[PDB]
Amino acid sequence: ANVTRKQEDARRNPNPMSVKSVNDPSQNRLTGSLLAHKVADEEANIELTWAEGTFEQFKDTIVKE
Amino acid sequence: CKPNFPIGQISENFEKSKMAKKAKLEKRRHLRELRMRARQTAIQLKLNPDGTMAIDEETMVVDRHKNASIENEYKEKVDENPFANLYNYGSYGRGSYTDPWTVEEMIKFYKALSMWGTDFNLISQLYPYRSRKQVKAKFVNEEKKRPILIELALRSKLPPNFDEYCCEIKKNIGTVADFNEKLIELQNEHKHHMKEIEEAKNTAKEEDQTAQRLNDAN
């Protein structure tokens, strides 16, 4: 609900180039905890076909010693 | 029991003094190997199903060390013994040892010194990897040992035994082109390309004058 509220902020207030650089050995980059949140918001959705079976899982285990 | 090399007692820890002397034999030797053979990374992107035509975070910048790392890996790994890096007065200095001259090169030299007076500019290229300095050191050398052949080189002022007409063209067969005016025509091309540049520059000067006047009136 705050996404459209954030969207409408800059629409009422509209007020206004990607070149390489070099990794320097006296400077650091984000990693660890906050890097795992950058990778966990953008990945593939899977809508699971939820069932309730499980006798196939039962007897397959029974027949194996 | 002379003062030159008696083996005479305990002599502990000389195995590295021996082998580094023995290893210097080849460091000077493979200089003789090379002399005889001398004679003869943009920006990348991706197709994400979620975000199509997205730009990746890592290739935005470059490391500048990974391409240096692989360069280092196929290098020789040597274990330093403190007797190898020995330095003397003959260290970190000029010069080398010139290859001692041959009778083959004498008849390429004195005939060049009989036709021309003494012209070290073109003798230097005749001897392809010899330099301007030591042929001048050879010139002062041959005054002292053979003082009579430099007189015969001076005295003979005429066409010699006319065998040098091939040797005239043996110099003139390398990259056959009329250098008296082929040097002129590409230099003409060099100023022709420059004559484009001011036209490309000065028309870029006048486009500045029309735009900076336009926003003045606006």
Side-chain angles (χ1 to χ4, degrees), chain A, chain B residues 2-217:
Chain A
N2 296 322
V3 174
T4 65
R5 189 260 179 190
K6 183 67 176 67
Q7 185 69 41
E8 73 180 4
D9 288 334
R11 298 285 77 75
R12 297 293 179 270
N13 302 114
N15 207 167
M17 298 173 69
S18 65
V19 187
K20 295 173 67 179
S21 294
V22 168
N23 205 167
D24 184 76
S26 297
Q27 187 61 257
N28 50 7
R29 188 181 62 84
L30 68 93
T31 187
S33 175
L34 82 164
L35 189 145
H37 285 175
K38 185 64 73 71
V39 306
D41 57 352
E42 44 98 20
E43 71 271 27
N45 52 2
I46 290 94
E47 299 294 328
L48 277 304
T49 67
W50 182 63
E52 194 269 328
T54 199
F55 190 76
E56 191 270 334
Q57 190 271 332
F58 181 77
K59 186 63 174 66
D60 195 2
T61 303
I62 305 300
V63 72
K64 182 67 174 68
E65 176 68 27
Chain B
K2 300 303 295 295
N4 193 2
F5 187 66
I7 180 70
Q9 258 179 353
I10 296 98
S11 72
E12 192 176 1
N13 208 164
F14 286 100
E15 71 274 14
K16 64 172 72 175
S17 177
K18 180 64 70 178
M19 69 186 177
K21 178 64 181 293
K22 291 169 71 177
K24 188 259 290 181
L25 189 148
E26 184 65 30
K27 295 300 290 292
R28 65 174 62 250
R29 184 181 179 271
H30 76 274
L31 265 294
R32 304 298 93 192
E33 291 178 357
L34 57 89
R35 184 172 292 184
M36 294 305 292
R37 69 182 295 276
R39 297 289 91 195
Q40 289 295 109
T41 61
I43 304 171
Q44 300 294 320
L45 73 158
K46 61 180 175 65
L47 67 164
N48 190 1
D50 284 331
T52 303
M53 306 167 197
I55 199 66
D56 55 359
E57 58 185 359
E58 186 176 1
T59 66
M60 180 65 75
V61 300
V62 72
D63 197 2
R64 196 168 62 90
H65 288 89
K66 296 286 103 177
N67 299 114
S69 73
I70 307 170
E71 193 271 333
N72 289 318
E73 291 181 357
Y74 63 103
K75 292 183 181 180
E76 183 67 26
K77 190 183 267 78
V78 64
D79 45 354
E80 176 65 26
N81 48 357
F83 295 154
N85 54 8
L86 174 63
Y87 59 90
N88 55 2
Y89 291 88
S91 177
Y92 297 150
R94 60 102 192 85
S96 180
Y97 176 72
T98 63
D99 204 8
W101 300 89
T102 61
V103 180
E104 177 187 1
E105 292 178 354
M106 293 303 107
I107 56 98
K108 296 187 288 182
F109 182 73
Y110 289 98
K111 190 180 260 77
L113 190 61
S114 177
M115 289 185 281
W116 295 271
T118 172
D119 291 332
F120 293 155
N121 292 317
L122 77 159
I123 303 169
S124 61
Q125 59 89 32
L126 177 60
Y127 292 157
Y129 297 98
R130 300 289 179 88
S131 178
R132 182 257 187 273
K133 182 171 69 177
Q134 78 274 25
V135 292
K136 185 178 183 293
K138 189 66 184 298
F139 181 75
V140 184
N141 192 5
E142 288 295 324
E143 177 67 28
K144 302 287 103 174
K145 60 182 293 294
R146 289 182 181 177
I148 59 172
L149 273 74
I150 189 165
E151 298 177 356
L152 188 146
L154 185 68
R155 188 262 178 194
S156 67
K157 293 294 187 288
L158 77 159
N161 285 320
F162 193 74
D163 201 3
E164 72 268 16
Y165 185 74
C166 182
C167 297
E168 176 67 32
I169 308 171
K170 185 266 300 295
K171 178 180 68 174
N172 295 316
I173 47 95
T175 310
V176 176
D178 286 331
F179 292 162
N180 300 114
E181 70 272 16
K182 191 264 290 180
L183 267 294
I184 297 172
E185 58 88 20
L186 90 167
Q187 185 182 2
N188 291 318
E189 194 274 332
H190 194 276
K191 65 180 68 66
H192 275 82
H193 186 275
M194 187 186 72
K195 191 166 88 272
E196 180 183 2
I197 292 302
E198 302 100 8
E199 185 64 31
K201 183 177 71 66
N202 210 164
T203 55
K205 189 258 183 67
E206 293 293 325
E207 68 184 1
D208 180 76
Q209 194 271 332
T210 180
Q212 293 180 356
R213 188 259 185 274
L214 195 276
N215 55 2
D216 193 4

